[PDB]
């Protein structure tokens, strides 16, 4: 028995491999991990304690392209092939999707030790907002921060915000070049241009106050734009690749946080701390339960986080509302009648209380959030091995879980004629969200314990949104004034555009233009201006 000869030929063979043409070796450097990846999947496909894994040809990339461009179609095909639980590789990571209310339950109500949101999100958010807040702190710090922010989002705060938001909308109609209602009776706008502006203007004025709003009338506004461009999906993958807009992002957050800090310190020095805005509120109520106070820098950062949170979700949403109503003059008509009924033909001034008596307007917001969940995919990093009840499936630590209530929003099974815009599906159910059972408190107020609602635009569990009532307040005022003031429709041959799933939120694909017309051509908006 002499296999020794063969053992020699192993060594000889490696040496020959080392000698190969400098190009052929490169080609091997491609084909070998290519083949390994394929064999690996086939091997993986034999495991019974793993959810099925979506096949992919290109290593590391995985299903990035198809998921990135059309995640709901991707999910539907996957669901057809595998059912509700399945995995797919995404830019070096394994994402395990759990579709439907069970998935909502599995991810949003996961134990604190099983999953981490901050491990999923911090490397995008921390550079944008700053240190020590949101996802750059332990979850218990986040919980209290959310408690602090909620303390400025009370009914009394909303009562005070409504005239301020209304004033901003009217000023925008008066002064913005997109409108100029005192000099033009009709015009064309791109809602992806107007809505982000109206959003930052109304959220600035109400949450941050008059000074900070006033700063947006200057080239300081460009910092917000710079900051905004650091809030993009690529920063999930590549958080710190050296380029110009990364530096501009960092500079922006320093500059903006600096401006907030400047105002905070001035207010403290002057004993000018009232109950006007979120800044006042946080200055008065910013101490953790262990007695550590948030620093002025952390307060500033938290303000950035909060304004950024409401910015894209709300802007995308009012864009979609305008776009759906543009081909539904019947709905604009019905909403107008409700406006005339509730505001006494317009001789009642809009208030927060009267907003609560506009069920069809609120249903319109609700239905838009059903058809256009701003965030098509929410993530968590799995921290401990997770057994999927009731299967043999185990989700290993190091995986990520992906939940998508927005996908369920669009399933006929849970919403008949799901692809039809029908505000009347919410008749006698016009509230932003409804807890169908018992409640629980994670630190920022009692919220629904079960997260099995097929409708979940604000998510649930410990990471649940706290801006929902502010968003309804802002969208409410905004659409109330739009409706009473204007009618609008599409250019010929235009209709509702498809979503752009590649950005941070599911905003419409641009340009998304509508034509407005004044209901009262001779109506003038008062106040001083220089145009
Ligand atoms: C480039 C190649 C191409 C083919 N490709 N390949 C893949 N993709 C892709 C994949 C996925 C996605 N995304 C879209 C964005 N999405 C996402 C974005 C934000 C997000 O936020 C969750 C947390 C953090 O931010 C906020 C958002 N928010 C909540 N309420 C208001 N805003 C948040 C929470 C708290 C605070 Cl204070 C601020 C903020 Cl912003 O919630 C979660 C998911 C993930 C999937 C985009 C592109 C591509 O485009
Ligand atoms: C209608 C618009 C909005 C929608 C659809 C929306 C959606 C959501 C969703 C789905 C979550 C859960 C995130 C997750 O589980 O990963 C969330 C969380 C949150 N939202 Fe919003 N949101 C909206 C507006 C706002 C506004 C106006 C604010 C600020 C006032 C805000 C601040 C937050 C915060 C602070 C969180 C906490 C995230 C966490 O705890 O990890 N949102 N939002």
From Swiss-Prot:
The gene is ERG11. One of its GO terms (cellular component) is endoplasmic reticulum. It is found in: Endoplasmic reticulum membrane. It is an enzyme of class 1 (oxidoreductase). Its EC number is 1.14.14.154. Its cofactor is heme. Pfam families: p450. Lanosterol binds at residue 121. The modification Phosphoserine is found at residue 453. Interacts with ERG28. Pathway: Steroid biosynthesis; zymosterol biosynthesis; zymosterol from lanosterol: step 1/6. It comes from the Eukaryota. It is the main target for antifungal compounds of the triazole family like ketoconazole which inhibits by coordinating the iron atom at the sixth ligand position. Present with 73200 molecules/cell in log phase SD medium. There is a cross-link at residues 111, 348, 449 (Glycyl lysine isopeptide (Lys-Gly) (interchain with G-Cter in ubiquitin)). Residues 1-15 are lumenal. Induction: Expression is increased during growth on glucose, in the presence of heme, and during oxygen limiting growth conditions and, unexpectedly, during anaerobic growth. Two upstream activating sequences, UASl and UASZ, and an upstream repressor element, URS1, plus a second possible or cryptic repressor element, URSP, are present in promoter. HAP1 participates in activation from UASl but not from UAS2, whereas the ROXl repressor represses expressio of ERG11. GO terms for molecular function: heme binding; iron ion binding; oxidoreductase activity; sterol 14-demethylase activity. Residues 37-525 are cytoplasmic. It is a single-pass membrane protein. This is Lanosterol 14-alpha demethylase CYP51. Sterol 14alpha-demethylase that plays a critical role in the third module of ergosterol biosynthesis pathway, being ergosterol the major sterol component in fungal membranes that participates in a variety of functions. The third module or late pathway involves the ergosterol synthesis itself through consecutive reactions that mainly occur in the endoplasmic reticulum (ER) membrane.
